[PDB]
């Protein structure tokens, strides 16, 4: 069954943990990027970004010019998920 399932269980939360624990012991920039690929392919949310705080991780990875252009496209598509305001001041 899909619901108690003896193999497989791992939630995408698990996975994006145990990944984000592997970024912060980088051990390749060529690693990193197939790092980044997988938090990308994983159903992402809200919950996921704020428990793990993956967001603050790989915002950043843009930092590393090998990396940075996939890290970038990653926070983008992670903006998509949280909400924004668009408060200024007039």
Same mark, same amino acid.
């Not at 193999?7 to 990944?19: H, N, P, R």
């Given at each position: 069954?899909?619901a108690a399932s003896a193999m497989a269980a791992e939630?995408?939360?698990?996975v994006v943990e145990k990944l984000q624990a592997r970024?912060?012991?980088?051990?390749?920039?060529?690693? &990193?990027?197939?790092?980044? %690929? $997988? @938090?990308?392919?994983?159903?992402?949310?809200?919950?996921?970004?704020?428990?793990?705080?993956?967001?603050?991780?790989?915002?950043?990875l843009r930092k590393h010019e090998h990396v940075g252009?996939?890290?970038?496209? &990653?926070?983008?598509?992670? %903006? $998509? @998920?949280?909400?924004?305001?668009?408060?200024?001041?007039?």
């Amino acid at each position: 069954s899909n619901a108690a399932s003896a193999m497989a269980a791992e939630s995408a939360l698990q996975v994006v943990e145990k990944l984000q624990a592997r970024l912060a012991a980088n051990p390749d920039p060529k690693k &990193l990027l197939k790092y980044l %690929k $997988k @938090l990308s392919t994983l159903p992402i949310t809200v919950d996921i970004l704020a428990e793990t705080g993956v967001g603050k991780t790989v915002n950043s990875l843009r930092k590393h010019e090998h990396v940075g252009s996939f890290a970038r496209d &990653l926070v983008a598509q992670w %903006k $998509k @998920l949280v909400p924004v305001e668009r408060n200024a001041g007039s």
